[PDB]
Write a protein that binds this DNA or RNA. Sequence first.
DNA 1: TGTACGTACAGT
DNA 2: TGTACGTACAGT
Lengths: 117, 117
Amino acid sequence: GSVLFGSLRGHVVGLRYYTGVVNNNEMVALQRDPNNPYDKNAIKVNNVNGNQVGHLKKELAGALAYIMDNKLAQIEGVVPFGANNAFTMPLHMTFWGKEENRKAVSDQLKKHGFKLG
Amino acid sequence: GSVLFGSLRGHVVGLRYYTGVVNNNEMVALQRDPNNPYDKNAIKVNNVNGNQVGHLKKELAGALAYIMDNKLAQIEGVVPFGANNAFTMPLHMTFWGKEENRKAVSDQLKKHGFKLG
DNA sequence: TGTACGTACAGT
DNA sequence: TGTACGTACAGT
């Protein structure tokens, strides 16, 4: 069905406000938070059990919201290290979808200063 | 004459091998090192007195060599902080040139994963 | 600024 | 991995 588009890093932030435990090398789920009064483009980050860990960094969510809202790609997330950080942790992301959507995803990331590695 | 194209960060590396002193907020000069056997795209970084400080990071020089070699832009460099680092220091760069060359510079940076901020 | 934090692990 | 290093200074 869906094919791989590529990979990208970013960060989970606001760890200080949530209690959802993450382990190194563990997947996390990205879920849009459209009614967030602080950022309309907000994207929450949950652990494998559905417990919130934090949010995607503001700038990254600025890029990704359009992709998620328009079902242009499914975004997988893995935390490579620093599961025990205080404030922030790194996020390895992979984008999957229909071949015909790759350009639109690639451009939406470029428009915000991100590039599919 | 020349007009501003914009700004970009990178890093000076290999500080360990040179003795050229830099102070915070001081300009540095970029000079191509074309006969470098380790990297053909090498770009040296000198202090205001002409003493070598280090090199542009490999990836960044990969982007910039073409720009410098083809006189597409003049690149100014300022070290914002960390003049007393051990191995690496940050570099705020600004690109100046003829209006008609901006696109070519912008694209050459994109091709290597850099963007004019 | 100094320091508490994040993370690379040290040219070209 | 732990740690020596670089640098942000701590959601959305």
